[PDB]
mmCIF file of C-alpha atoms in Angstrom:
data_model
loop_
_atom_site.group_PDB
_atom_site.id
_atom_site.type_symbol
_atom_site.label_atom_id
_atom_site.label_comp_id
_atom_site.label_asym_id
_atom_site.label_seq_id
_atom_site.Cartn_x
_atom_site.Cartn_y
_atom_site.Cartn_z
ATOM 1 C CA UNK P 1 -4.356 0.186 16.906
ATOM 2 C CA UNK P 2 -6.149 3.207 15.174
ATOM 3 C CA UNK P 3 -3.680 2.857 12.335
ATOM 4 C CA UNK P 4 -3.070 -0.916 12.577
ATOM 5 C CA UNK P 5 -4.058 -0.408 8.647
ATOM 6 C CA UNK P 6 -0.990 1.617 8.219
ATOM 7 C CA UNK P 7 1.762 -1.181 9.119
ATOM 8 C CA UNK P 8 2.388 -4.123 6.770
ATOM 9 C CA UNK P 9 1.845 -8.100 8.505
ATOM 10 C CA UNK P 10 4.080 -8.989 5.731
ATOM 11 C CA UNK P 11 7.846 -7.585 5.571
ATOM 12 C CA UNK P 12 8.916 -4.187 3.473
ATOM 13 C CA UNK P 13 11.650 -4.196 1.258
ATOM 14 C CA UNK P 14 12.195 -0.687 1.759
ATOM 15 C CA UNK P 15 15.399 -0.090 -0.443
ATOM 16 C CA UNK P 16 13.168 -1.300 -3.272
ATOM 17 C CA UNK P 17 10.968 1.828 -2.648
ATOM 18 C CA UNK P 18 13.409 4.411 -2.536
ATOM 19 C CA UNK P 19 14.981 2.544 -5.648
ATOM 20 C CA UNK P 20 11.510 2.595 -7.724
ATOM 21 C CA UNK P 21 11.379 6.449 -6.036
ATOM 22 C CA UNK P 22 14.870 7.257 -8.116
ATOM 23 C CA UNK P 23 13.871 4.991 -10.940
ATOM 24 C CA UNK P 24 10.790 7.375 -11.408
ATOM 25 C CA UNK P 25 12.087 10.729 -10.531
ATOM 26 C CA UNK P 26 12.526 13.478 -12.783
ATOM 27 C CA UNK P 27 15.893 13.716 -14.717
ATOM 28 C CA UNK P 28 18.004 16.692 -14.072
ATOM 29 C CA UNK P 29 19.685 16.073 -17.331
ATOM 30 C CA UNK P 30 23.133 17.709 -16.341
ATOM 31 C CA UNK P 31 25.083 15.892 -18.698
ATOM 32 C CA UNK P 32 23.464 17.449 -21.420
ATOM 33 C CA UNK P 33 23.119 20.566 -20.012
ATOM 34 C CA UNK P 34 27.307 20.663 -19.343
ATOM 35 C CA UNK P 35 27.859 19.283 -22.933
ATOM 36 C CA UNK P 36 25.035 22.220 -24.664
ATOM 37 C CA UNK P 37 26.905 24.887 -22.349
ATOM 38 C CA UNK P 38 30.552 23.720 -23.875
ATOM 39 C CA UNK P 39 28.743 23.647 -27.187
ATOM 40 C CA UNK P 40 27.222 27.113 -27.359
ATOM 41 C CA UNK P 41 30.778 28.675 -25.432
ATOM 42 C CA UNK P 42 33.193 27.492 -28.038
ATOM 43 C CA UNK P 43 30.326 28.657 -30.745
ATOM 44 C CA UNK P 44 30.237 31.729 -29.401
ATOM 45 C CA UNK P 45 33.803 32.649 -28.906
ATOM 46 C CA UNK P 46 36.125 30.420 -31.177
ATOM 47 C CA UNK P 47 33.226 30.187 -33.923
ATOM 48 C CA UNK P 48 31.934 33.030 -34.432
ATOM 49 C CA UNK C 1 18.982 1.899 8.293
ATOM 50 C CA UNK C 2 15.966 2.087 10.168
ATOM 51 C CA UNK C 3 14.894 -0.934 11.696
ATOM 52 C CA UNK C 4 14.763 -4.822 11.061
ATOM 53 C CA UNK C 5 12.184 -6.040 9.093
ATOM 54 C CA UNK C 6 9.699 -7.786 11.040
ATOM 55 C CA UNK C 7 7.496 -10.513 9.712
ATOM 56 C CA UNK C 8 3.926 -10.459 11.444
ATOM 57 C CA UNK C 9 2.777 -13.399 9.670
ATOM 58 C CA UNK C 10 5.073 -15.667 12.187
ATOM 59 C CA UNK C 11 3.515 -15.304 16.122
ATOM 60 C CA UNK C 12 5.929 -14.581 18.621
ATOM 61 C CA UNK C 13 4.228 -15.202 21.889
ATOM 62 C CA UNK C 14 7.437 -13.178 23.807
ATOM 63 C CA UNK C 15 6.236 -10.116 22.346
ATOM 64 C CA UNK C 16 2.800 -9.619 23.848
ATOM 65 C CA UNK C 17 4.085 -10.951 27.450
ATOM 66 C CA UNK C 18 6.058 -7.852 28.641
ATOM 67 C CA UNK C 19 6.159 -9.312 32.074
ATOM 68 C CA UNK C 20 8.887 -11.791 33.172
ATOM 69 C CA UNK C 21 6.652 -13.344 35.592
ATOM 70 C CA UNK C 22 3.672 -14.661 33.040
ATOM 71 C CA UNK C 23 5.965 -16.518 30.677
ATOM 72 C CA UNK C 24 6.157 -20.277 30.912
ATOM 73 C CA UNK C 25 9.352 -21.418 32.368
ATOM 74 C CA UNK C 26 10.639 -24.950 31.930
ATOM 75 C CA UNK C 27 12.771 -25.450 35.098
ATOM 76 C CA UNK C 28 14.120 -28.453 37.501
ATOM 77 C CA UNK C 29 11.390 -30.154 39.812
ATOM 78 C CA UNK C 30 13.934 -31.990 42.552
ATOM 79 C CA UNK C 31 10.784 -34.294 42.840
ATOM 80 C CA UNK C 32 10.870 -35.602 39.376
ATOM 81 C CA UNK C 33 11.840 -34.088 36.357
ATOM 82 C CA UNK C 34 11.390 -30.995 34.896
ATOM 83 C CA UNK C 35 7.926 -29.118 35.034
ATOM 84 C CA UNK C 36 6.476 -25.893 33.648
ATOM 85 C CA UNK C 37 5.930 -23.032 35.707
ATOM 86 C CA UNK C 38 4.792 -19.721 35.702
ATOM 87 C CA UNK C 39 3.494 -17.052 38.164
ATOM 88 C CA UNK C 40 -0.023 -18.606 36.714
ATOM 89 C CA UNK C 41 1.231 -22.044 38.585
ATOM 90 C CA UNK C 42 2.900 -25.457 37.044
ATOM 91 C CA UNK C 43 0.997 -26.240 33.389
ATOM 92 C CA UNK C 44 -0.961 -29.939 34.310
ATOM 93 C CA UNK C 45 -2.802 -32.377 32.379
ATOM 94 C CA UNK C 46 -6.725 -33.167 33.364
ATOM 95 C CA UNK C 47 -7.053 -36.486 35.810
ATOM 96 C CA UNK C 48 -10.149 -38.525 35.579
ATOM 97 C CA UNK C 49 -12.237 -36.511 37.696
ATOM 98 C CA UNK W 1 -22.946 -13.849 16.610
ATOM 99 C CA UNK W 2 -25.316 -13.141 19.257
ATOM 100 C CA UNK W 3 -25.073 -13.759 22.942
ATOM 101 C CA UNK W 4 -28.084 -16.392 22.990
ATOM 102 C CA UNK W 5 -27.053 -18.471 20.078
ATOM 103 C CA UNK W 6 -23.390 -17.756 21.942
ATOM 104 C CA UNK W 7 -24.780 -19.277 25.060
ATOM 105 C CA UNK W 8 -26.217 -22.390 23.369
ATOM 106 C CA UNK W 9 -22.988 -22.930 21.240
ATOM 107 C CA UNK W 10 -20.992 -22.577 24.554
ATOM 108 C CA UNK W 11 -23.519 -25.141 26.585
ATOM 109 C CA UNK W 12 -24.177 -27.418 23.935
ATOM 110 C CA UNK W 13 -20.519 -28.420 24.249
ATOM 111 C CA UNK W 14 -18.813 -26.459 27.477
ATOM 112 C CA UNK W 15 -15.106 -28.088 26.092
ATOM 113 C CA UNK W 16 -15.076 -26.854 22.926
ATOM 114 C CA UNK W 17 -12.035 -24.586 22.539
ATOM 115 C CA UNK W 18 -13.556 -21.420 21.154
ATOM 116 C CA UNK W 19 -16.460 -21.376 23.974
ATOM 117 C CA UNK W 20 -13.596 -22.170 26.589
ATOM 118 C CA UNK W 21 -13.366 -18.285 27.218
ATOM 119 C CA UNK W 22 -16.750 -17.617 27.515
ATOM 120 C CA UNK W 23 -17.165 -20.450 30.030
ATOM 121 C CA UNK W 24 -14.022 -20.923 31.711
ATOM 122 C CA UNK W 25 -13.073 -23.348 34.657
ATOM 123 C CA UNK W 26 -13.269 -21.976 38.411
ATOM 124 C CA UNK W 27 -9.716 -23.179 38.643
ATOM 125 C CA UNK W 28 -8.786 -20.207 36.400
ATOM 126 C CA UNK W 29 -10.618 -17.336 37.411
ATOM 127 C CA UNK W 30 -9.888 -18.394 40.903
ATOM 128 C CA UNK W 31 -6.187 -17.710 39.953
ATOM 129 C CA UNK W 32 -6.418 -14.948 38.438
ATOM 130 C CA UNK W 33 -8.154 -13.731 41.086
ATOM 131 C CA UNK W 34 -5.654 -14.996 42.937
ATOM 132 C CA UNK W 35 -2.857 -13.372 40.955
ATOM 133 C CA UNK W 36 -4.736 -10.135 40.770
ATOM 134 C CA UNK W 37 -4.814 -10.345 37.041
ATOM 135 C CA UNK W 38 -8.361 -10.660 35.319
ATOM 136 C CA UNK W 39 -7.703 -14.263 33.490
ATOM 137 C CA UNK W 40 -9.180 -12.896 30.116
ATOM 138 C CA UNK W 41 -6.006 -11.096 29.851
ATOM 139 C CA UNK W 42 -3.419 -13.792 29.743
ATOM 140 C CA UNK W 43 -5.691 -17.208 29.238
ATOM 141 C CA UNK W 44 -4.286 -18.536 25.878
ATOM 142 C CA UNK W 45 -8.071 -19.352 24.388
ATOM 143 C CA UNK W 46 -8.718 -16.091 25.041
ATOM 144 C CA UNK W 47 -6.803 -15.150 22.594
ATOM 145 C CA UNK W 48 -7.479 -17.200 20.023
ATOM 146 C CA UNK W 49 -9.108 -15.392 17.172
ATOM 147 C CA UNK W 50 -11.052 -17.808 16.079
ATOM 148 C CA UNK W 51 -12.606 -17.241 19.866
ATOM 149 C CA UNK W 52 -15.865 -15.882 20.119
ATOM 150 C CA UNK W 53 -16.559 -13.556 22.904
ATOM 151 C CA UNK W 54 -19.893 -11.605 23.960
ATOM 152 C CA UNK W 55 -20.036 -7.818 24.622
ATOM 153 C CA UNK W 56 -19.422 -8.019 28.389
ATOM 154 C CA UNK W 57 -16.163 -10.314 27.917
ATOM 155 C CA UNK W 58 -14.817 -8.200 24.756
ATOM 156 C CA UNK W 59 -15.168 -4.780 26.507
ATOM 157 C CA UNK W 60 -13.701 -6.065 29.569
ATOM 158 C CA UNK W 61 -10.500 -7.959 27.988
ATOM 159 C CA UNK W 62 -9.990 -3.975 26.146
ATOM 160 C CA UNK W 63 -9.187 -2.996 29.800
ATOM 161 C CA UNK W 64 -6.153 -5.586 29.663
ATOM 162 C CA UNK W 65 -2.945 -3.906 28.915
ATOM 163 C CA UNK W 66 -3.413 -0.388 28.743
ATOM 164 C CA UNK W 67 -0.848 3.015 29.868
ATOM 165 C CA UNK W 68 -2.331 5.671 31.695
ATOM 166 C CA UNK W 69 0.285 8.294 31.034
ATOM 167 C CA UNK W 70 -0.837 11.834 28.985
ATOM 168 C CA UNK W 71 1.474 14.655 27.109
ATOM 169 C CA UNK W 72 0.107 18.386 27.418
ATOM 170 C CA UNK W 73 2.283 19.823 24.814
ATOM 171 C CA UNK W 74 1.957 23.529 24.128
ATOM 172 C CA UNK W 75 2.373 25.744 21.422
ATOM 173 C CA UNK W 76 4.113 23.884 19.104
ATOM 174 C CA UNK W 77 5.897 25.412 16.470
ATOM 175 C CA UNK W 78 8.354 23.827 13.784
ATOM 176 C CA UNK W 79 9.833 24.805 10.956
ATOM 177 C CA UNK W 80 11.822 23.068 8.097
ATOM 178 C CA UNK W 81 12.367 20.390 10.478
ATOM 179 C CA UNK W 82 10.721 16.954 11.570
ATOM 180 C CA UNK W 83 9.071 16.573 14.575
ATOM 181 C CA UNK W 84 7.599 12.948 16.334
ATOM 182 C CA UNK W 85 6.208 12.364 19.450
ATOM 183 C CA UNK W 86 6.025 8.779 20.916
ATOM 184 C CA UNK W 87 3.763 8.347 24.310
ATOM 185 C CA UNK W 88 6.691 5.976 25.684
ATOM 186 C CA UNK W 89 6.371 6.584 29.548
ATOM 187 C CA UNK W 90 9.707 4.419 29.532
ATOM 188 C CA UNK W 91 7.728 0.860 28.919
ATOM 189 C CA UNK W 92 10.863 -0.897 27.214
ATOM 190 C CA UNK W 93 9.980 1.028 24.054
ATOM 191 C CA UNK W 94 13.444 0.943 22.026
ATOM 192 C CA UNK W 95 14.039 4.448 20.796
ATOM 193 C CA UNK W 96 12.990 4.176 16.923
ATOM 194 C CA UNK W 97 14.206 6.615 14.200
ATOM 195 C CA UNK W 98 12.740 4.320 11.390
ATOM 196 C CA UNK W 99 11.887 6.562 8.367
ATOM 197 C CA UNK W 100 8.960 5.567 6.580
ATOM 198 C CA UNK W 101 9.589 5.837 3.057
ATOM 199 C CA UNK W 102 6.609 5.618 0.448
ATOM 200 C CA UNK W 103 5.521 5.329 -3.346
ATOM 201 C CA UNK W 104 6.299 8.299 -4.840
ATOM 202 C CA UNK W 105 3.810 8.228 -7.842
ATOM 203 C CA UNK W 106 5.626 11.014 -8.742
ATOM 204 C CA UNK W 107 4.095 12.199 -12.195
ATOM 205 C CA UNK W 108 6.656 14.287 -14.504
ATOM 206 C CA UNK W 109 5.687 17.575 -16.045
ATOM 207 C CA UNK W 110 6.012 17.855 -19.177
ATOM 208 C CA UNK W 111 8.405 20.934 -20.878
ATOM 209 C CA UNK W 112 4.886 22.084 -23.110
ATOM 210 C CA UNK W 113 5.101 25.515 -23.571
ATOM 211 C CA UNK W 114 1.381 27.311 -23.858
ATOM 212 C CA UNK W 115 0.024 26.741 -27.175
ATOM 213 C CA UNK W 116 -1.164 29.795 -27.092
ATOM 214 C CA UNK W 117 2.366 30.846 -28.005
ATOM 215 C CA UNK W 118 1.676 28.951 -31.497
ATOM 216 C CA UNK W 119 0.418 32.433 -32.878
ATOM 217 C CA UNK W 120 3.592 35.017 -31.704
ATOM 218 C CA UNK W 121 6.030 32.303 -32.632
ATOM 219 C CA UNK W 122 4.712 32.152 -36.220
ATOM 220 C CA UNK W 123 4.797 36.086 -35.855
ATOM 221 C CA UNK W 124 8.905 35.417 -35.142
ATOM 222 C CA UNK W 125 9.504 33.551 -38.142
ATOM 223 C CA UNK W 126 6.743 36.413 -40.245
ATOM 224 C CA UNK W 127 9.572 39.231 -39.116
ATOM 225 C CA UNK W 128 12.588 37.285 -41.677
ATOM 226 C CA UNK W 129 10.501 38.839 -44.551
ATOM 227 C CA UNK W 130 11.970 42.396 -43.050
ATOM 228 C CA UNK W 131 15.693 40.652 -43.397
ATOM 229 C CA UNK W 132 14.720 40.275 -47.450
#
């Protein structure tokens, strides 16, 4: 009972949470990252 | 995963009785009927007196 | 409330159901004396929470279900890891590996370089007048 507080009387929808938690997450932005790479190779090589 | 979710908002009374012997018991009275029962005795309505 | 004005709510009307704790029949603490379980702890009104109950009668329902098991643990020492300890002294306590997840109110930093860079960079840009 010293953290009665911390439980919920109603039910948790705990997918929800860890959906909201990816929702608003930081954005490792890898498929711009892979396309930028590609870019700056071919500049590089078969450009320049 | 994890576990179920549980709604407290709906009282269970067979989760505070952890012993068998405490919970009422509707079972066969050869005498007449059925009664409830428990290790607390038969549940009984007030007579006059 | 307190225990007087308890007392006269209780004997003003001895059947009411929240003062049926406070004063209940000899019938039931003779059983659970019987029994050799204190009747506070199972008797229904009892529990009610609308139910007042003095001092005395509060304090002594707390002794109602209670363990009396203890962990001495030593030095403890984890690392990258999870520990939990549960003080089940095997009391029909299913074995629980429910992870508690939370609200990340995760704020984002931002890619802000030091404006204090504002200064050198305009220096980069000052060195194309060598290129002329």
């Amino acid at each position: 009972l010293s953290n009665s507080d911390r439980f919920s009387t109603v039910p948790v929808n705990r997918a929800k949470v860890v959906q909201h938690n990816i929702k608003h997450s930081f954005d490792l932005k890898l498929h711009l990252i892979s396309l930028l790479s590609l870019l700056v190779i071919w500049i590089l090589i078969v450009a320049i | 995963g994890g576990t179920p979710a549980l709604d407290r908002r709906v009282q269970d009374v067979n989760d505070t009785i952890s012993d068998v012997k405490q919970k009422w018991r509707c079972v066969v009275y050869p005498g007449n009927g059925f009664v409830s029962a428990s290790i607390f005795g038969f549940q009984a309505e007030v007579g006059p007196n | 409330m307190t225990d007087e004005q308890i007392y006269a709510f209780c004997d003003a009307n001895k059947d009411d159901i929240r003062c049926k704790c406070i004063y209940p029949d000899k019938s039931i603490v003779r059983i659970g004396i019987d029994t050799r379980l204190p009747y506070y702890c199972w008797y229904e009104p009892c529990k009610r929470s609308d139910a007042l109950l003095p001092a005395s009668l509060k304090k002594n329902i707390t002794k109602c279900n209670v363990s009396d098991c203890t962990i001495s643990l030593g030095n403890v020492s984890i690392t990258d890891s999870k520990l939990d300890v549960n003080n089940v002294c095997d009391s029909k306590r299913v074995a629980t590996e429910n992870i508690a997840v939370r609200y990340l109110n995760q704020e984002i930093r931002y890619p802000i370089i030091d404006i204090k860079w504002l200064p050198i960079g305009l220096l980069a840009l000052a060195i194309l007048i060598l290129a002329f």
